[PDB]
DNA sequence: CCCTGTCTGGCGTCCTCTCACCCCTATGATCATGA
DNA sequence: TCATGATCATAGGCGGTAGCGTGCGCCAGACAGGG
């Protein structure tokens, strides 16, 4: 990938960690349904109002060397190509080629 | 009574790990329970292997990771206090837990 | 014949200060409460602050002092000179009750202190007193590849054994 | 007594290779300090060469540069001996910063 | 030293460095708990004297 | 400021051999015996 | 069972309600006294 998506991933991760907190406390006032409605609105209107970037479903998982957005693995953090790579030159502990 | 979880991905080197434990924990104290055997976890994984495509081109890997459970059934003073400084072989993630 | 900053020794005013408050000789030193668990035991005993700073009241020529030496309350005058200087009573006249410092029992712990848990064999290394709940005992706090348990100790131990 | 005059864990280990707690003595493995004690399993001869250092609660004047017989001080402030003993030791008063 | 008597007769620094670490710890526990006026200055005479 | 007395700092051989000496006193705590 | 007495072990810097010091000597350079 480009060094512009990565950066632009960065930013979104960035975002996301600063506005964990308050986004969290918003979908829970709208969750809660004891409570008033004009409450609620205000607070998807607040939603509303706090940047795209903030959202955890906006950031893609990429290699954390390549940048690839597809071919990801959560344990590793890298794509199937630089997985293999690992497996095969010893830097991944434990991973070995499997047969049953 | 100390159970105690022994984790790795050698199993050569968990067993070493097992033993050195139970060595510690005889001399000072008495009766260690023992070295039981848990079941172990191959977390696989299938990737393919051609840069663009090849889809019926994959390697499956895995990873095996050991699990010994030891257990001391008298904590005394002398013992629980030996493993403070009796740290194992490294790539052994072990965890102590007493009752 | 006046108040006057000494120092001076310890723990046995009442005869020096039978010399003294024979008179109506003025006497003060700064204040602290101590609960110090001396061998096994907390013991709490609020004594003077100071080590021999000591407030007197008495009276210069008459009286030499080489004839009152045999007593304690004597290391010397408060100088900053060669002449015994004449102290202010500060305490005496315009700060007389005092320390809301703390009772911090200089040094001795609290709960929660962050000091020696063990001795023996398995010392070498600050374990914590994450509460000094009762001196008796408790499996240590100790910290390896699990959970964080409290003291592994008895009375007089759970500090320096 | 740590740690006091003689120390271990200012000064070194008292015997070579020889951790206070105890706990390495390989061959194969040397450089790793301990943890216990924290002591860097190392030689004795680190004892003849690390020195320590105490912080003074109050200034503290030099006894060479004061009364050497001439005084350093003294013919430096262009002030004689008598008034800087008679400062330095707590029964006089010298001035600074007199203001107008 | 050890003289082979069960005591050590210390040599002449280590009474230096001790008599200096007594006094300065003594010091920093009266800056502490606060001198009493014209009070904080006995003790550092007796430092700057050790 | 120009002497002239006082003061306090320096210094006072080398090499070797032998011997003694290197806290005791006071206070507090614990144990045992007697009432 | 409780209280008292005796014995043993462990713990710090003139000792005293002052005074101890007193039998080297030269040189030298600064600090100060007298004029």
Redesign the pocket.
């Given at each position: 990938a480009k060094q512009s998506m990565k950066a632009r991933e960065v930013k979104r991760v960035a975002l996301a960690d600063k506005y964990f907190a308050k986004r969290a406390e918003l979908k829970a006032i709208i969750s809660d349904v004891n409570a008033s409605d004009e409450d609620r609105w205000n607070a998807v209107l607040k939603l509303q109002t706090l940047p795209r970037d903030s959202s955890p479903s906006r950031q893609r998982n990429r290699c954390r060397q390549t940048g690839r957005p597809h071919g990801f693995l959560r344990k590793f953090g890298l794509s199937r190509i630089k997985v293999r790579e690992a497996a095969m030159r010893g830097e991944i502990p434990g991973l070995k080629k499997a047969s049953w | 009574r100390i159970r105690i979880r022994l984790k790795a991905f050698d199993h050569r080197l968990i067993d070493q790990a097992t033993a050195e434990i139970v060595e510690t924990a005889k001399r000072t104290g008495a009766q260690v329970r023992g070295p039981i055997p848990l079941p172990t976890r191959k977390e696989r994984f299938t990737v393919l292997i051609s840069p663009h495509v090849n889809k019926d081109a994959r390697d499956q890997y895995e990873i095996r990771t050991h699990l010994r459970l030891v257990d001391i059934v008298e904590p005394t003073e002398k013992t629980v206090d030996a493993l403070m400084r009796l740290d194992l072989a490294a790539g052994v993630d072990v965890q102590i837990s007493l009752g | 014949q006046s108040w006057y900053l000494l120092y001076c020794?310890r723990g046995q005013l009442q005869?020096?200060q039978e010399?003294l408050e024979r008179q109506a000789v003025n006497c003060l030193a700064p204040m602290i409460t101590l609960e110090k668990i001396v061998?096994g035991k907390r013991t709490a005993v609020s004594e003077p602050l100071f080590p021999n700073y000591l407030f007197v009241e008495f009276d210069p020529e008459v009286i030499?002092?080489?004839?009152?030496?045999?007593?304690?309350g004597?290391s010397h005058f408060v100088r900053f000179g060669a002449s015994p200087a004449i102290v202010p009573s500060a305490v005496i006249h315009q700060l007389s009750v005092y320390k809301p410092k703390d009772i911090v029992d200089p040094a001795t712990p609290y709960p929660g202190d962050k000091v020696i848990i063990t001795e023996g064999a398995f010392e070498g290394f600050q374990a914590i007193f994450t509460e000094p709940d009762g001196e008796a005992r408790s499996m240590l706090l100790l910290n390896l590849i699990n959970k964080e348990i409290k003291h592994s100790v008895k009375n007089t131990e759970f500090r320096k054994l | 007594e740590r740690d006091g005059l003689f120390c271990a864990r200012i000064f070194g280990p008292v015997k070579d290779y020889e951790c206070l707690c105890g706990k390495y003595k390989r061959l194969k493995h040397r450089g790793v300090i301990c943890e216990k004690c924290g002591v860097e399993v190392t030689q004795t001869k680190v004892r003849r060469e690390r020195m320590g250092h105490i912080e003074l609660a109050s200034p503290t004047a030099h006894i060479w540069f004061l009364?050497?017989?001439?005084?350093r001080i003294?013919?430096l402030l262009d002030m004689?001996?008598?008034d800087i003993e008679r400062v330095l030791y707590f029964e006089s008063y010298v001035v600074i910063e007199g203001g107008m | 030293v050890p003289?082979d008597?069960g005591?050590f007769?210390?040599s002449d620094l280590n009474?230096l460095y001790r008599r200096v670490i007594n006094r300065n710890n003594r010091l920093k526990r009266l800056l502490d708990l606060a001198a009493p006026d014209i009070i904080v200055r006995n003790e550092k005479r007796m430092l700057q004297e050790a």
């Open positions: - | - | 020794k005869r020096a010399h061998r030499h002092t080489t004839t009152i030496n045999a007593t304690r004597v | 009364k050497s017989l001439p005084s003294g013919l004689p001996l008598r | 003289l008597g005591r007769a210390t009474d």
